[PDB]
Design an enzyme around this catalytic site. Structure first.
Site, mmCIF file in Angstrom:
data_model
loop_
_atom_site.group_PDB
_atom_site.id
_atom_site.type_symbol
_atom_site.label_atom_id
_atom_site.label_comp_id
_atom_site.label_asym_id
_atom_site.label_seq_id
_atom_site.Cartn_x
_atom_site.Cartn_y
_atom_site.Cartn_z
ATOM 1 N N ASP A 34 41.362 40.142 51.371
ATOM 2 C CA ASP A 34 39.852 40.636 50.997
ATOM 3 C C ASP A 34 39.692 41.578 52.017
ATOM 4 O OD1 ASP A 34 36.836 40.117 50.575
ATOM 5 O OD2 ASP A 34 37.990 38.486 49.381
ATOM 6 N N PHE A 81 32.014 42.981 42.598
ATOM 7 C CA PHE A 81 30.716 42.792 42.554
ATOM 8 C C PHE A 81 30.551 41.852 41.054
ATOM 9 C CE2 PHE A 81 29.136 45.249 45.961
ATOM 10 C CZ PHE A 81 30.043 46.343 45.799
ATOM 11 N N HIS A 171 36.561 37.697 26.246
ATOM 12 C CA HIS A 171 36.001 36.735 27.170
ATOM 13 C C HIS A 171 34.385 37.128 27.158
ATOM 14 C CE1 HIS A 171 36.270 33.730 30.134
ATOM 15 N NE2 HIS A 171 35.805 34.699 31.149
HETATM 16 O O1 LIG Z 1 33.805 30.858 33.525
HETATM 17 C C1 LIG Z 1 33.463 31.554 32.719
HETATM 18 O O2 LIG Z 1 34.067 31.593 31.415
HETATM 19 C C2 LIG Z 1 32.892 32.891 33.169
HETATM 20 C C3 LIG Z 1 32.744 34.009 32.153
HETATM 21 C C4 LIG Z 1 31.942 35.213 32.577
HETATM 22 C C5 LIG Z 1 31.767 36.117 31.705
HETATM 23 C C6 LIG Z 1 31.171 37.358 31.927
HETATM 24 O O3 LIG Z 1 30.896 38.617 31.445
HETATM 25 C C7 LIG Z 1 30.528 37.417 33.353
HETATM 26 C C8 LIG Z 1 30.927 36.624 34.351
HETATM 27 C C9 LIG Z 1 31.549 35.459 33.970
HETATM 28 C C10 LIG Z 1 31.703 34.213 34.924
HETATM 29 C C11 LIG Z 1 32.392 33.235 34.531
HETATM 30 O O4 LIG Z 1 32.749 32.244 35.313
#
Ligand SMILES: O=C(O)c1cc2cc(O)ccc2cc1O
Ligand SMILES: O=C(O)c1cc2cc(O)ccc2cc1O
Ligand SMILES: O=C(O)c1cc2cc(O)ccc2cc1O
Ligand SMILES: O=C(O)c1cc2cc(O)ccc2cc1O
Lengths: 306, 306, 306, 306
Positions: A34, A81, A171
């Site tokens: 990190d 970030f 996602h």
């Molecule tokens: O757990 C998830 O599915 C997820 C999905 C997303 C999608 C995104 O566009 C930003 C941040 C997250 C944070 C997360 O924890």
């Protein structure tokens, strides 16, 4: 020794669960890297002691030096970030920096990108790291489908793993949930609907809950990192142990679903050669339309990132 | 202690692999019971030492006394003659003897019958043991489908577990292989056929090989006991750990597929209450016809057994 | 792929349990090699199906061709006549034949010899295979101590793995059981004797039983192969996963205990570089005398082998 | 179902790793209980999805209601203020409240106390819960010794689990590290000192590091919770699976080491009947003196707690 070396670029909460699980599974030596001084050394130290409880022998070390990427077999990127479109160019700069270090230090590493929005960040890292298209993927579908599978399994009173399901495209909020590709013990879900063991309305509620799970967890004053971590490790393990599992991940599309020059979620086969196969689901026009909206959104954000 | 007690009625080759696996998995204390004097004590002794290698603590003891059935949580029956219709009445007498001892000593045990032909022998044991219909099953579909799943997985270069498939009706040569219910990573096999990753002719060869696997192994001068053992333990473990896995087993039919008062292979859910659910596949008329032939054969042999 | 390749030279009972365990543990691809036509193919086929039950992806293939040693990472030798000093020269010829094939096909393989008498056969194979002294060991102490550890653990009502013990010098009837090096949860056994939880006379009976265990099993009309198999796999796994376990094995002595140019049982450390360390116990004169008798017997039989 | 129910009284960082590990190991259904509204529901939800990745079937639920203790088989208490003697009476009040709910809802539960100072808090909970002395223990020695074992193992280049060691008396800064009871692969550490593989001065540094590990981690801007969690789960698992492991824990002393009516760290045997055995190490006068200082400190803090 020829134990695998696994570098976790980012040592926050997801990084800490990943390290734990790697030791539990004896998958390889771990570097918690990190930007934050000393914290990764502390988590590494804590985690290292668990070798005793787990009957394992994995080194767990902290790092504030990019050159510790040298010799990495697997690199998992969570850095970036999280506190919105404004973060896109900042996270691009982080992918650029990491990519340069991968190219220099571990060009043959298998890379898993987690940083959101993942379908964008994975392609940015691909481009800056120079790795082959079969050697970099993003976390998406294994995590999103874990929710859908789990929720159906609890309704049907069956083992969670026995529900299989496909969520593709991207996602995040444009994820495409494919009702037609849900099975229970390998049986089409529609049979369970026909039998009244589960209703269409129930499934619609479960789909909404799936899409909104990260939000639901945040609104409960927690944050999602245990399932993300486990999903990543399932992917990493498939690679390391040459399991050749079919796992839904963000990968470079080269014509599948009518899309090229972009990353998107689709079932792939992960083994010793990385992405050994990209599986293209034979989607109908209505499913392809939603897949298209997911890609459009990935593209919109990719443009803002530069 | 409340460790599970697992009595293996029959300590031949299948019994010996089952004992090994139970220790490996730390599933419970084992009794290797057999009619043969002293041999089960010797296998038990050998097997007991593996607790050290496995980090387990399961007692493994031999027995030539039926009263050691007392307190059994799980009873697995492999005993019976294998050296043809003429063995049917002899094996009936063995099921009768065992059933009487189960009724006396462990009426609340969960029972798994292996002795062939299993769809006959399981019902004979059910009737003589007096146990509830949700507490006795036969090994069939988990074993037969392991072959089909494995062979497809090697052709497609995917993880074996990621192929799911259904073989129903009966164990043995009338087993019904259902092409329509094969999936790969939860995707219909037909998509892989449409894509030319696997041909219809290949699958026909794989189906034949599946039906004839035990014969193929015998003709290679070996005998099948490792996969049978593993299949049984997957079933036993699902019960003991309340996993609620969907597993294809021989179970009492009460109208499913148009059949009652007989045992046949079908997906069931195995958890702490035994057979928690019997799943009836929505077979078409052509599949139901083959299911009917399987049942007819089980009935023919059941009549000869008496 | 870089999965390990593990060739089992000999596909009898020990070979069959080893293959099972390798699949259960997903340790690598397996070749069951034997001189007997077709039988290893049949056992391999049976074993391969268990990938489904075990969530593994290990190939299991049979072989009647020595050239399948090519690319082996680990070679485990059980082949040899067991039906006495007269077998010594016959088994020497088998070690010679195998050694020549190892030298030709897999000179960088890690070798585990099981064929008895092991402390003789391992050195014969070492000499004919040409491998480095850190790359070949014999099964002895892990197996013999599993018995001692197990029997004490049952008397004391503790987890078997929590008893640790050392048996050195040789496998077989001259094995040296070292009372002074027994511990329970890391505590000297003498404390448990002082407390009357176990008596000296009990331990003497347990020592005799340990030395005579293989005989006890044979006299019960079974034969020892499950514990031997598990012990070998613990050794093989330590190598493959770089665990660096301290395991008592037959290894080349170069001055330890006053002995050179011979193999004998002693704790070693097994990791990715093979035998990484040879540990010399600081035996007293009475223990060294028994160690000397063990070596003398290995030497007597080694002379007859030529 | 007769799956074990495990209630985690406190859903902070240690609670979250414990839940993860329970699912990974399929040990039982989990309740994450906390005083904080909604957060345990969020962590529970996140954790529940991992059943899919782990092939498990454990419910994971959040709770803000003490009555969810009903039916608990195991209760693990991490709740309490950590931001010094002034916290002692506050944490006493928390133990009192929890104890009353255990007495009411799950008087037959096996209890593991983690809240510091543990050797004090465990006895306070014992007294208020009313449970039998064999049914409540405190986390101490498994965690402290994991550090000592790990650090020696890295110096000696052996598998961490192969180092065994004893730290007794109390958790915290008065912990008694017993050099005389360290072993490596069951061999006395002194042999490795005699051989110059490790020096006395090195070990003194390792002892200091062991005592000061939690401080070392905090000073690196992390906090210890992964190893604590793993240690607790090793204890809980030994109970649940009747492993009968020898594990060093805080337990009621009834004359051992000259001490009664107080809790202190000592090896015990954990199985299905809880603390089945309390093992009293045969300490010399110099070791007993340090054990006495540890107890004196536990007593000093116990007086302030009331
Ligand atoms: O757990 C998830 O599915 C997820 C999905 C997303 C999608 C995104 O566009 C930003 C941040 C997250 C944070 C997360 O924890
Ligand atoms: O392995 C099998 O599938 C199998 C099947 C059958 C079927 C049968 O009717 C008799 C014996 C066997 C023995 C076996 O090993
Ligand atoms: O199991 C054993 O310890 C063992 C030991 C020996 C020793 C020996 O000299 C010949 C054969 C065997 C066979 C065995 O099974
Ligand atoms: O990790 C430890 O050993 C530890 C020990 C102690 C001891 C103590 O007295 C208070 C708090 C802690 C916190 C900890 O994390």
């Amino acid at each position: 020794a020829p134990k695998a070396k696994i570098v976790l670029v980012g040592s926050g909460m997801i990084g800490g669960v990943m390290a734990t699980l790697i030791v539990q599974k004896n998958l390889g030596d771990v570097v918690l890297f990190d930007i934050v001084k000393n914290m990764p050394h502390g988590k590494a130290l804590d985690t290292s002691h668990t070798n005793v409880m787990a009957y394992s022998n994995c080194k767990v070390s902290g790092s504030n030096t990019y050159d510790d990427l040298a010799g990495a077999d697997v690199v998992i990127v969570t850095a970036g970030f999280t506190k919105r479109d404004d973060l896109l160019p900042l996270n691009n700069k982080i992918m650029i920096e990491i990519g340069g270090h991968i190219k220099k230090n571990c060009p043959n590493a298998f890379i898993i990108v987690v940083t959101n929005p993942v379908d964008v960040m994975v392609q940015l890292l691909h481009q800056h790291s120079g790795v082959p298209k079969n050697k970099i993927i993003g976390l998406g579908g294994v995590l999103d489908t874990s929710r859908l599978k789990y929720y159906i399994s609890q309704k049907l009173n069956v083992c969670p793993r026995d529900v299989n399901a496909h969520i593709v495209g991207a996602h995040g909020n444009k994820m495409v949930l494919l009702k037609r590709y849900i099975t229970v013990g390998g049986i089409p879900l529609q049979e369970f609907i026909n039998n009244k063991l589960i209703s269409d309305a129930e499934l619609e509620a479960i789909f909404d809950r799936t899409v909104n799970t990260a939000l639901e967890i945040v609104n409960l004053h927690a944050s999602p990192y245990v399932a993300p971590a486990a999903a990543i490790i399932e992917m990493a393990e498939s690679y390391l142990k040459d399991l050749k599992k079919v796992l839904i991940c963000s990968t470079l599309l080269e014509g599948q679903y009518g899309h090229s020059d972009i990353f998107g979620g689709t079932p792939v086969v992960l083994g010793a050669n990385g992405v050994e196969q990209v599986i293209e689901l034979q989607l109908n026009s209505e499913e392809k339309a939603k897949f298209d909206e997911a890609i459009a959104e990935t593209k919109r954000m990719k443009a803002l990132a530069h």
